[PDB]
């Protein structure tokens, strides 16, 4: 609930560009054209929002940025 919307504000406001590029099924690089840095970089600020241990290996090896969102619900 607050997690998704929270991450959505972080992802969208960041990799969303015009509020739409954000996509869980997207690899955050070839789908909505995103830089691997800003991508996992946005998931790092995300780990600080809900206090998580997402490292650069998470957002990168994670099934998808969305899984990162699912990663937060797994801690709640």
From Swiss-Prot:
4'-phosphopantetheine is transferred from CoA to a specific serine of apo-ACP by AcpS. This modification is essential for activity because fatty acids are bound in thioester linkage to the sulfhydryl of the prosthetic group. GO terms for molecular function: acyl binding; acyl carrier activity. Keywords: Cytoplasm, Fatty acid biosynthesis, Fatty acid metabolism, Lipid biosynthesis, Lipid metabolism, Phosphopantetheine, Phosphoprotein. It is found in: Cytoplasm. GO terms for cellular component: cytosol; membrane. Its main location: cytoplasm. The modification O-(pantetheine 4'-phosphoryl)serine is found at residue 36. Pathway: Lipid metabolism; fatty acid biosynthesis. One of its GO terms (biological process) is lipid A biosynthetic process. Residues 1-76 form the Carrier domain. InterPro entries: ACP (IPR003231), ACP-like_sf (IPR036736), PP-bd_ACP (IPR009081), Ppantetheine_attach_site (IPR006162). Belongs to the acyl carrier protein (ACP) family. Carrier of the growing fatty acid chain in fatty acid biosynthesis. This is Acyl carrier protein. It comes from Bacillus subtilis (strain 168).
């Amino acid at each position: 609930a607050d997690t998704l919307e929270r991450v959505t504000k972080i992802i969208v406001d960041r990799l969303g560009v015009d509020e739409a590029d954000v996509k869980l099924e997207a690899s955050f690089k070839e789908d909505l054209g995103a830089d691997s840095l800003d991508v996992v970089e946005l998931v790092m600020e995300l780990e600080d929002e809900f206090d998580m241990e997402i490292s650069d290996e998470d957002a990168e090896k994670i099934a998808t940025v969305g899984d990162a969102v699912n990663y937060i619900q797994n801690q709640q």
